Design an enzyme around this catalytic site. Structure first.
Site, PDB file in Angstrom:
ATOM      1  N   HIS A  33      -2.556   6.965  -1.200  1.00  0.00           N
ATOM      2  CA  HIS A  33      -3.599   7.626  -0.389  1.00  0.00           C
ATOM      3  C   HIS A  33      -3.052   8.355   0.850  1.00  0.00           C
ATOM      4  O   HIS A  33      -3.777   8.502   1.849  1.00  0.00           O
ATOM      5  CB  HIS A  33      -4.693   6.623   0.033  1.00  0.00           C
ATOM      6  N   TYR A  79      -0.652   7.603   2.956  1.00  0.00           N
ATOM      7  CA  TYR A  79      -0.191   6.806   4.089  1.00  0.00           C
ATOM      8  C   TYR A  79       1.353   6.824   4.090  1.00  0.00           C
ATOM      9  O   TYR A  79       1.959   7.709   3.485  1.00  0.00           O
ATOM     10  CB  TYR A  79      -0.864   5.434   4.052  1.00  0.00           C
ATOM     11  N   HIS A  96       0.856  -1.187   0.000  1.00  0.00           N
ATOM     12  CA  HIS A  96       0.000   0.000   0.000  1.00  0.00           C
ATOM     13  C   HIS A  96       0.893   1.238   0.000  1.00  0.00           C
ATOM     14  O   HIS A  96       1.359   1.699   1.045  1.00  0.00           O
ATOM     15  CB  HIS A  96      -0.964  -0.027   1.187  1.00  0.00           C
TER      16      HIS A  96
HETATM   17  C1  LIG Z   1     -14.509   1.607   2.855  1.00  0.00           C
HETATM   18  C2  LIG Z   1     -13.242   1.678   2.039  1.00  0.00           C
HETATM   19  C3  LIG Z   1     -12.070   1.090   2.499  1.00  0.00           C
HETATM   20  C4  LIG Z   1     -10.912   1.162   1.739  1.00  0.00           C
HETATM   21  N1  LIG Z   1      -9.759   0.632   2.243  1.00  0.00           N
HETATM   22  C5  LIG Z   1      -8.616   0.612   1.478  1.00  0.00           C
HETATM   23  C6  LIG Z   1      -7.452  -0.034   1.924  1.00  0.00           C
HETATM   24  O1  LIG Z   1      -7.405  -0.660   3.009  1.00  0.00           O
HETATM   25  N2  LIG Z   1      -6.325  -0.002   1.122  1.00  0.00           N
HETATM   26  C7  LIG Z   1      -6.343   0.657  -0.101  1.00  0.00           C
HETATM   27  O2  LIG Z   1      -5.325   0.674  -0.797  1.00  0.00           O
HETATM   28  N3  LIG Z   1      -7.469   1.300  -0.538  1.00  0.00           N
HETATM   29  C8  LIG Z   1      -8.621   1.247   0.225  1.00  0.00           C
HETATM   30  N4  LIG Z   1      -9.761   1.852  -0.268  1.00  0.00           N
HETATM   31  C9  LIG Z   1      -9.773   2.399  -1.668  1.00  0.00           C
HETATM   32  C10 LIG Z   1     -10.239   1.155  -2.503  1.00  0.00           C
HETATM   33  O3  LIG Z   1      -9.280   0.098  -2.562  1.00  0.00           O
HETATM   34  C11 LIG Z   1     -10.535   1.466  -3.981  1.00  0.00           C
HETATM   35  O4  LIG Z   1      -9.418   2.147  -4.522  1.00  0.00           O
HETATM   36  C12 LIG Z   1     -11.755   2.351  -4.192  1.00  0.00           C
HETATM   37  O5  LIG Z   1     -12.784   1.860  -3.332  1.00  0.00           O
HETATM   38  C13 LIG Z   1     -12.193   2.173  -5.659  1.00  0.00           C
HETATM   39  O6  LIG Z   1     -13.197   3.104  -5.964  1.00  0.00           O
HETATM   40  P1  LIG Z   1     -14.704   2.500  -6.035  1.00  0.00           P
HETATM   41  O7  LIG Z   1     -15.170   2.327  -4.589  1.00  0.00           O
HETATM   42  O8  LIG Z   1     -15.509   3.556  -6.751  1.00  0.00           O
HETATM   43  O9  LIG Z   1     -14.666   1.173  -6.702  1.00  0.00           O
HETATM   44  C14 LIG Z   1     -10.921   1.782   0.486  1.00  0.00           C
HETATM   45  C15 LIG Z   1     -12.091   2.352   0.022  1.00  0.00           C
HETATM   46  C16 LIG Z   1     -13.248   2.270   0.781  1.00  0.00           C
HETATM   47  C17 LIG Z   1     -14.507   2.909   0.258  1.00  0.00           C
END
Ligand SMILES: Cc1cc2nc3c(=O)[nH]c(=O)nc-3n(C[C@H](O)[C@H](O)[C@H](O)COP(=O)(O)O)c2cc1C
Ligand SMILES: Cc1cc2nc3c(=O)[nH]c(=O)nc-3n(C[C@H](O)[C@H](O)[C@H](O)COP(=O)(O)O)c2cc1C
Lengths: 376, 376
Positions: A179, A181, A176
């Site tokens: 975003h 982090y 990861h």
């Molecule tokens: C509730 C939630 C939790 C997420 N947790 C992570 C995560 O743990 N690691 C990560 O790289 N992205 C995380 N994301 C981003 C998602 O992996 C993904 O990029 C995003 O949901 C894609 O857009 P979409 O929801 O329109 O499909 C999260 C997104 C949401 C909504």
């Protein structure tokens, strides 16, 4: 349907191109994977489908959400094994996402209430909130800037966690690095104000991600390592003065790791900014996504290997991405929360369940987690 | 039903709280009000109901959409009077919204080929487009940051247009100070990069809207002036580093105009942000809905007069807004497009017609404009 043409990701013969994006859901009570996670991932697994877990702790300092799983203890490894086994029994491929939040944490999530660690002492601003264990929103505090030796220890935390994921039976790991982090706190010039060899130039800002990726590649092999970044997403005050230049510099480094290692990574996974077209404004629905699309396509063109795109994809946009050559695989987040059978619904062009954000991060093992209905 | 409890707006005894939001529809061929507008507003007019017109041009250079009406020529005034008359015959109150788009224009809407005017030289970014006369989407050009001395002439354009609206028989005017158009280009510190007296401090950034409102109040009286703002909106790159301080600074100058005038404005009209950004991220949505309700309630508590809310309201949310004391009046846009008798349908809790965005901005005097059905 181009989303259902097979794709060869390294050794893995994927039957379709719909990927479960990594999503934090906070059901791993006290950082231990729970049976509920087994049910959740099993619901979503498909034969020849690729799944990426929720962000998973690499150390006691790596969390900034409640009840996120770890993979740094043997107890965690044993519970992850049960989840991996039920996913493999459905014929799916699954990677564990290794997640360190850096400054995006709080004393309540740190051992002995210590300060979160980062590239910098600058805190995330009050534009952003942290989810507290009682479900309220809290304020990010000032992090501590780590030095070179401690950086090498965090790298070793990634390496040890990658080995543990392989021990649990995972097909690979995802770094990861997105975003805002920990890794993105080194990559972004809006956060990284270091003057040592990890700060300043693009080369210096890319050192930390290169060292993390190299350490896990040298431990388990490049084929079992995916990398996720988001140069153009400024979540948690993670802006760069030149996102396309930063993205290309990271891609550069990954291509070089691949040449030196003699092997390709499993993939590069990039999340793109996605602007919701407000329907209640005069011009909200006249917008263009072309610039962001060109940024994504330029990263894909520059990277020598498999490209996973993510961020606001729908059935129609996923089909277009694969059809146009813009991506090899498409990961879905929110629609996969509420559609356990998202792959089949996309195949059939079936209606999709709405998702309830209120239960994205609650702790119930069923409500808002495994009780979204299948196609009837 | 709180939406049908009567409301006293100045001298206007409104019989219900359902307001027709101002909506650009592009039926005013060659900027001249048309008979179709009369039928359209007559369809939506009710006894004791409040209507606000589409944004209306204050000068030949003020438009950014095709076939939007003006009120800066005497021909325009004459055609508007015919529309006002049919609305009044139905017992409704109607305000004309005065609209200058600033940098949200194009050479095709610039009769002397001049750059669009603005607070700044920065163009609207690539992800926003303009509606062209042939229905295609065009690119926003570079605007010209007007000199200090030109501001008073634009203020004068508002004043003359307000006089013209009164000559036409309108009950009042509404200043469109929202959604990233000309006034909002001075308000928002994400747009206003001036270093003269109209830039920098919140006070300096509020000077333009204060002078516009003062000019129109001194021309037609405070009772005949409403003001629309959107301190927190994602539209045409209109962002601010502290929307609440910005909104409260605007409210405090409006309150002060009322104190020195000796009369209250007709109302303050505020767009609901409906913030949906960063939905694809881990933390982007945390605490944003709470911040949004705080913003709107803090403004209404501070503003000494009638408060109209708009943006994403349904029957249920409109009831709750009036029930909780959050707004005196609720304006509806998209549902009023497709439901000429929205008021009656809301009163009866009848089914609501779906709307067709494809005909929001087309030129047909009937199709998608006056041919949505009433209750049978
Ligand atoms: C509730 C939630 C939790 C997420 N947790 C992570 C995560 O743990 N690691 C990560 O790289 N992205 C995380 N994301 C981003 C998602 O992996 C993904 O990029 C995003 O949901 C894609 O857009 P979409 O929801 O329109 O499909 C999260 C997104 C949401 C909504
Ligand atoms: C087609 C359309 C045209 C609009 N034109 C204007 C306008 O000219 N001036 C203005 O202040 N707002 C305008 N708006 C915003 C509306 O006044 C109103 O705030 C919005 O439609 C309310 O949200 P709703 O559609 O969910 O009810 C427009 C909105 C739409 C959908």
């Amino acid at each position: 349907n181009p989303l259902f043409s097979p794709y060869k990701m390294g050794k893995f013969n994927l039957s379709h191109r719909v990927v479960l994006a990594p999503m934090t859901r906070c059901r791993a009570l006290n950082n231990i994977p729970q049976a509920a996670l087994g049910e959740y991932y099993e619901q979503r697994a498909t034969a020849g489908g690729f799944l990426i877990t929720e962000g998973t702790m690499i150390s006691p300092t790596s969390a900034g959400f409640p009840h996120v799983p770890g993979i740094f203890t043997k107890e965690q490894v044993r519970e992850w094994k049960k989840i991996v086994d039920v996913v493999h029994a459905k014929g799916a491929v699954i990677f564990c996402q290794l997640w360190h939040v850096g400054r995006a944490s709080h004393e309540v999530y740190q051992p002995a209430g210590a300060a979160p660690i980062s590239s910098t002492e600058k805190p995330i601003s009050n534009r952003w909130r942290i989810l507290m264990p009682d479900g309220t929103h809290g304020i990010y505090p000032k992090p501590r800037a780590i030095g070179t030796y401690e950086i090498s220890q965090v790298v070793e935390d990634y390496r040890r966690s990658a080995l543990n994921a392989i021990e649990a039976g995972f097909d690979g790991i995802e770094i990861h690095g997105a975003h805002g982090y920990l890794i993105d706190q080194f990559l972004k010039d809006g956060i990284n104000d270091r003057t040592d060899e990890y700060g300043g130039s693009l080369a210096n800002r890319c050192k930390f991600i290169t060292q993390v990726v190299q350490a896990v590649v040298s431990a388990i092999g490049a084929d079992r390592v995916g990398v996720r970044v988001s140069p153009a997403i400024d979540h948690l005050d993670a802006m760069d003065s030149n996102p396309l230049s930063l993205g290309l510099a990271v891609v550069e480094r990954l291509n070089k790791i691949q040449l030196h290692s003699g092997s390709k990574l499993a993939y590069l996974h990039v999340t793109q900014p996605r602007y919701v077209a407000y329907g209640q404004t005069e011009a909200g629905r006249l917008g263009s996504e072309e610039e962001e699309a060109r940024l994504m396509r330029t990263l894909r063109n520059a990277y020598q290997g498999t490209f996973i795109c993510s961020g606001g994809y729908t059935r129609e946009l996923g089909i277009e991405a694969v059809a146009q050559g813009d991506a090899d695989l498409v990961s879905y987040g929110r629609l996969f929360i509420s559609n356990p059978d998202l792959v089949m619904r996309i195949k059939l062009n079936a209606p999709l369940n709405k998702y309830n954000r209120k239960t994205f991060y609650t702790q119930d093992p069923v409500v808002g987690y495994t009780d979204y209905p299948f196609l009837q």
